[PDB]
């Protein structure tokens, strides 16, 4: 579950800079 | 001082080891890879750099086998090579005798940075051009450097000649074969590399060159960050959130995740208003999510941003003439031969 964990962290970061 | 003599094998020669003596041995570099010495040849009196690394001896050295195949004006040349001992006895050390080059692009750009000045466009044109020229060369052999960064770009302030170095992370990319994704230096990693893609091409070097070009214009790295996500956030903050097919081009495993859609920041607002449009244009066609959409090194050399270099009356700010920029070979032009019409000015061929 590497891409699943990676994507969540990215989405989280992108929701904050939105 | 003391004189050291070894039987060294010519790098680009027909494998005929000969005697080599040198003096003035001093360390000019230390790293986890090994040690780098400076030395002066007893024969010609020329300065060389000696990259001393360890070797398992059970297997062939990848860096060496690549360097022996390279002969280009913008790649640091392999003079000789030999084997010896050193720290940690009972092991074999590989010694690469290379052309000594005083400066690096990084240290030079760092000067103007702490001096709060801007690196003149003519040097941005000169350095970037010679880089792609080196990239065009090794790509024709299917060899990918994979560690393109300003630190690995050596400079001679007098002649303004660039020579690519450090092929320790270089690898001949075979189509349809797995590749390490934890390669490349941060700040200059391609987006597909950050996404963990193992099917990447040599176009990762083009992305790195794009980061270098941007850093030279901006005075600071364009995509800073400790982790992969950190860097990716910086990239997305400029290029905008990549489309689904752009994600497919990089890593298909991230195609269906629904990332927040962030508006791209205009390239003109990225750099200083003093920045030439051609530089901005070159950069936009360099930094692309889709690897195939990125310009080829040979294509980059023919960009209009380098038109000033093809002017007959061009001169270095120190008065000297520009280096050989038009001495393209056939192997070098193997990518796209009709480009010679642009790359080689009429006052060069005739
Ligand atoms: C920056 C150093 C310590 N790392 C390094 N130097 C290399 C080669 C080199 C080539 C030409 C030189 C030189 C060093 O110092 C001055 O001229 C190389 O492959 N690596 C990883």
Return the DSSP state at A1.
-
CB contact under 8 A, A17 and B233: yes
Residues B317 and B157 sit within 8 Å (Cβ to Cβ)? no
- Residues B28 and B47 grouped into a single domain: yes
- How is residue B191 written in tokens? 């987006």
Decide whether any atom of ligand 1 lies within 6 Å of the B288 Cβ: no
Are both B72 and B161 inside the same structural domain? Answer: no
- Residue B263 contacts residue B224 (beta carbons within 8 Å): no
CA of A9 to the centre of ligand 1 (A): 37
Q: Which chain A residues contact residue B233 at CB under 8 A?
A: 10, 13-14, 17
Q: Which of B326, B311, B309 is nearest to B128 (CA)?
A: B309
Say yes or no: B133 and B184 in one domain: yes
Last residue of a domain, one of B102, B132, B154: B102
Q: Is B246 a domain residue?
A: yes
Q: Inter-chain contact A2–B196, Cβ cutoff 8 Å?
A: yes
- In short, whether B28's Cβ falls inside 6 Å of ligand 1 is yes
Contact, B128 vs B211, CB < 8 A?
Answer: no
Q: What is the CATH number of the domain that holds B89?
A: 3.30.200.20
| Position B278 in a domain | yes
B33 and B173 belong to one structural domain: no
Phi, psi (deg, nearest 5) at residue B26: -150, 150
Q: Do the domain assignments include residue B187? A: yes
Q: Which residue of A has its CA nearest to B195?
A: A3
User: Does B137 lie in the same domain as B76?
Assistant: no
What residues of A are in the B interface, CB distance below 8 Å? 2-3, 6-7, 9-11, 13-15, 17-18
Tokens of B338: 């009709």
Among B102, B127, B147, the domain boundary falls at B102
* Cβ within 8 Å, pair A7-B257: yes
Q: Which of B102, B137, B154 is the last residue of a domain?
A: B102
The answer as to whether B310 is a domain residue is yes
| CA neighbor of B287 nearest in space, from B271, B272, B267 | B267
The first and second tokens of residue B71, run together, are 């002969």
Domain shared by B53 and B155, yes or no: no
Nearest CA to ligand 1 atom 2: B29
CA distance B55 to B139: 26
Cβ of B241 within 8 Å of Cβ of A18? The answer is no
**Displacement of CA B204 from its chain's centroid (Å):** 11
- Please tell me whether B247 is known to bind a ligand: no
Which residues make Cβ contacts (< 8 Å) with residue B61, sequence separation at least 6?
A: B55, B94
Method: X-ray
C-beta separation of B241 from B265 below 8 A: no
B12, B119: one domain: no
Q: Are residues B63 and B128 in the same domain?
A: no
Residue B152 belongs to a domain: yes
Note whether B212 and B188 are within 8 A (CB).
Answer: yes
Residues B211 and B297 in one domain: yes
Point out the catalytic residue in the list B71, B90, B147, B158. Answer: B147
Tell whether residue B31 is among the known ligand binding residues. Answer: yes
Domain with residue B131: its CATH number is 1.10.510.10
CA of B166 to the centre of ligand 1 (A): 7
Based on the fold, state whether residues B145 and B234 are members of the same structural domain: yes
- Burial of B146 per CB tally in 10 Å (0-12, 13-18, 19+): buried
Inside any domain, residue B149: yes
Say if CB B164 and CB B153 are below 8 A apart. yes
Whether B229 sits inside 8 A of A6 (CB atoms) is yes
Q: How far is A1 from chain B (nearest CA, A)?
A: 11
The number of domains in chain B is: 2
Task: Provide the 10 A C-beta neighbour count for residue B149.
Answer: 22
On whether both B10 and B56 belong to a single domain, the answer is: yes
Could you give the CA distance from residue B319 to residue B310 in angstroms, rounded to a whole number? 17
The CA dihedral of B192, B197, B200, B203, to the nearest 10 degrees, is: 10
Q: What is the 3-state secondary structure (H, E, C) of chain B?
A: CCCEEEEEEECCCCCCCEEEEEEEEEEEEECCCEEEEEEEECCCCCEEEEEEEEECCCCCCHHHHHHCCCCCCCECCEEEEEEECCCCCCCEEEEEEEECCCEEHHHHHHHHHHCCCCCCHHHHHHHHHHHHHHHHHHHCCCEECCCCCHHHEEEECCCCEEEECCCCCCEECCCCCCCCCCCCCCCCCCHHHHCCCCCCCCCHHHHHHHHHHHHHHHCCCCCCCCCHHHHHHHHHHHHCCCCHHHHHHHCHHHCCCCCCCCCCCCHHHHCCCCCCHHHHHHHHCCCCCCHHHCCCHHHHHCCHHHHHHHCCCCCCCCCCCCCCCCCCCCCCCCCCHHHHHHHCCHHHHC
CB B29 less than 6 A from any atom of ligand 1: yes
Structure tokens at B218: 């901006």
Is position B101 annotated in a ligand binding site?
no
Residue B179 marked in a binding site? no
Q: Are residues B180 and B319 in the same domain?
A: yes
- Looking at the CA of residue B99, tell me the nearest atom of ligand 1: 11
Q: Catalytic residue at B147?
A: yes
Residue B69 is part of which domain span?
6-102
B1 in a structural domain: no
Q: Tell me how long chain A is.
A: 18
Nearest to B262 among A6, A9, A18 (CB): A18
Classify residue B70: in a domain, yes or no: yes
Instruction: Tell me how far the alpha carbon of residue B293 lies from the centroid of ligand 1, in angstroms.
Output: 33
Two tokens, residue B319: 């008065």
């Amino acid at each position: 579950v590497e891409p699943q964990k990676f994507a969540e962290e990215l989405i989280h970061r992108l929701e904050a800079v939105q | 001082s003391k004189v050291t003599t070894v039987v060294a094998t010519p790098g680009q020669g027909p494998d005929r080891p000969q005697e080599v003596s040198y003096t003035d041995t001093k360390v000019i570099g230390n790293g986890s890879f090994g040690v780098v010495y400076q030395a002066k040849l007893c024969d010609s009196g020329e300065l060389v750099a000696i990259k001393k690394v360890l070797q398992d001896k059970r297997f062939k050295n990848r860096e060496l086998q690549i360097m022996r195949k390279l002969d280009h004006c913008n790649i640091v040349r392999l003079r000789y090579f030999f084997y010896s001992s050193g720290e940690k006895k009972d092991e074999v050390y590989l010694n690469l005798v290379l052309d000594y080059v005083p400066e690096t692009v990084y240290r030079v750009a760092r000067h103007y940075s702490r001096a709060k000045q801007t690196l003149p466009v003519i040097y941005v044109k000169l350095y970037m051009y010679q880089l792609f020229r080196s990239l065009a060369y090794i790509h024709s052999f299917g060899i990918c450097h994979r560690d393109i960064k300003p630190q690995n770009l050596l400079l001679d302030p007098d002649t303004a000649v660039l020579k690519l170095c450090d092929f320790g992370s270089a690898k001949q990319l075979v189509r349809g074969e797995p590749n390490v994704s934890y390669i490349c230096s941060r700040y200059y990693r391609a987006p597909e590399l950050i996404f963990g893609a193992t099917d990447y091409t040599s176009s990762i070097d083009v992305w790195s060159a794009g980061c270098v070009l941007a850093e030279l214009l901006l005075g600071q790295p364009i995509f800073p960050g400790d982790s992969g996500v950190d860097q990716l956030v910086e990239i997305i903050k400029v290029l905008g959130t990549p489309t689904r097919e752009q994600i497919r081009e990089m890593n298909p495993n991230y195609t269906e995740f629904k990332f927040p859609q962030i508006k791209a920041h205009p390239w003109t607002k990225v750099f200083r208003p003093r920045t030439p449009p051609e530089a901005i244009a070159l950069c936009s066609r360099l930094l692309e999510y889709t690897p195939t959409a990125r310009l080829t090194p040979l294509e980059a050399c023919a960009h209009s941003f380098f038109d000033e270099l093809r002017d007959p009356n061009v001169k270095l700010p120190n008065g000297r003439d520009t280096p050989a920029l038009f001495n393209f070979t056939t192997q070098e032009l193997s990518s796209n031969p009709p480009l010679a019409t642009i790359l080689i000015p009429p006052h060069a061929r005739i």
